[PDB]
Design a protein around this ligand. Structure first.
Ligand code: G93
Ligand code: G93
Lengths: 324, 324
């Protein structure tokens, strides 16, 4: 049984209201991982139990080069811990914040890998629902690693629907901002937003006030830099079509519509999944504990245990990759 | 009732996440022993209660020249303590790390003594499950003393099976890396790995990542130095057969298959158990407190009590060798 003192706790990689993520060393092997630590108290209060159990359940059976691999899922009396692959290259958000914009070529590389992962998830009836730059990390070679599966939905095949109002506001599809249910096409909209950010250096829609933001998402016409290629303009127009039935990827062939798009004309899709495409950017990390692609805001902070206030057991948190 | 203050605490012999082992002097007699000290908090959190109770229960009834003898098992409000024979000669891991390789002759001596112990344990339906160089120590005369019985299973006769995924990764048998249950043949595989190490100066399989390691154990063909004897190659090929049914020692005659192997052609097995075989290496210790065959990393450290945070009683921890 895996416990807290099986790991050394080295650096804070990220923190939010959800909890915290820490660079750990596994004592027994000396190998480095990221550990997401969540307080059960917060999870229950927020009504996120089912979502968090689902996060473990999906990760236990997913295997794909561009999804983050789970090593352990374990828990204590007051905490839930995910031990997972450390994405040395950090978030795409980090890189785009520094570089401001990616070339169409570089965006195409990341985009092809995200499309590959979303095809795989959708084939297994999983809707990810949280595509954003913050959840798109890079491994040490510069390949995509999708992280944070805390808003996934299972059992969603072509035409099936979902009702939970969830996601990140700036990335929410217009149909989610309407009453009743929505389908898997929301993931393609999400790819639309991140592709737009990568090539245009800004969100297609933004206001600090969510009420204004959601009106923009529902109502505003997207704009493009004049210099963008016709097929990049076509790709983003198709992914960010407000009607999910008319959206690129929103038909019965799902990822195939996106894969066959003229923006990805140069891409051989079997090379993508086989990791044969060369990353344009290779993270220049020089050790296993190197956190240069993570914000100082987090890594400067000292690690500190929070004071707490019968069975408090969560299912799906006694998992090991060695055992299943 | 035996207590903590009945002993002087002299030198740290070894430490891990499990707990610590200290060289102690029994105040009343002035005799020296090793004391393994475990924290109940850690044992409970790790779900190792049954394993630790078993460790005491097995040691209370075992008697064989090459098994470490338990003097006392006792407990405090937050600790469990094993007082046992101090193996002055240290671990085989220590000696092999220094010398790099043993001659086939010296490997044969240690191998014979381990086989004798494993025969004895298996005859009493005990599977040891943790055969490794770290657990193979030497007494002051140079004879084998198996230590650390914390992964034993009782009641395992010929054909009976076990389900717990436990052991040390580098020493795990291939069948343990498959679903469902495994038999007592795991111990002969374990002997295989230690014999290989002794004669070939490396583990037959190694990778720092366990996922890679387990694939090697399941899939990789073992290699031998060209100079190894035909019967050494044969012994190792037989003990390290991936199929437990085809493995040397894996039949209904158990240790007899191994004892009758041509590598041990020179061995009289009754002389082995009667300790009439001369150790090739005699520990050159010059006093009862001499810890030259223990790593400085441990013995340089000062002895320190850890701060803690109703009945917390463990059964099988009221044992004395004078009383049963
Ligand atoms: C700290 C960033 N971060 C990371 C990693 N950081 O380095 N390698 C990582 N992997 N993993 C996560 C997960 C996760 C997960 C699973 C796979 C269990 O679903 N959820 C959330 C994360 O941040 C969220 C916020 C933290 C604050 C800054 N931006 C991102 C993760
Ligand atoms: C520190 C080494 N060590 C020793 C001895 N050291 O000198 N004489 C010993 N005996 N005994 C044990 C036991 C035990 C036991 C019973 C018989 C109660 O089952 N478990 C574990 C030990 O280390 C584990 C690790 C410690 C770190 C270095 N390598 C070995 C022992």
């Amino acid at each position: 049984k895996v416990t807290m003192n099986d790991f050394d706790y080295l650096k804070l990689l990220g923190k939010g209201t959800f909890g915290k993520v820490i660079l750990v060393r596994e004592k027994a092997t000396g190998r480095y991982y990221a550990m997401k630590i969540l307080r059960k108290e917060v999870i229950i209060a927020k009504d996120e139990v089912a979502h968090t159990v689902t996060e473990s359940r999906v990760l236990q059976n997913t295997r794909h080069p561009f999804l983050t691999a789970l090593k352990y899922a374990f828990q204590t009396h007051d905490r839930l811990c995910f031990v997972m692959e450390y994405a040395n290259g950090g978030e795409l958000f980090f890189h785009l914040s520094r570089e401001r914009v990616f070339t169409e070529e570089r965006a195409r590389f990341y985009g092809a890998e995200i499309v590959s992962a979303l095809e795989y998830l959708h084939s297994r009836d999983v809707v990810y629902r949280d595509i954003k730059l913050e959840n798109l990390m890079l491994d040490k070679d510069g390949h995509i690693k999708i992280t944070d599966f805390g808003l996934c939905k299972e059992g969603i095949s072509d035409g099936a629907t979902m009702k939970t109002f969830c996601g990140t506001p700036e990335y929410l599809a217009p149909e989610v901002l309407e009453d009743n249910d929505y389908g898997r096409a929301v993931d393609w909209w999400g790819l639309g937003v991140v592709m737009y950010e990568m090539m245009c250096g800004r969100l297609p829609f933004y206001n600090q006030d969510h009420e204004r933001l959601f009106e923009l998402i529902l109502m505003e016409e997207i704009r493009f830099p004049r210099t963008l290629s016709p097929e990049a303009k076509s790709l983003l127009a198709g992914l960010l079509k407000k009607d999910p039935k008319q959206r690129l990827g929103g038909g019965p062939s799902d990822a195939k519509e996106v894969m066959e798009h003229r923006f990805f004309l140069s891409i051989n899709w079997q090379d993508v999944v086989q990791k044969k495409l060369l990353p344009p950017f290779k993270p220049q990390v020089t050790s296993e504990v190197d956190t240069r692609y993570f914000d100082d805001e987090f890594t400067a902070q000292s690690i500190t245990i929070t004071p707490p206030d019968q069975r408090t057991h969560f299912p799906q948190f006694d998992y090991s990759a060695s055992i299943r």
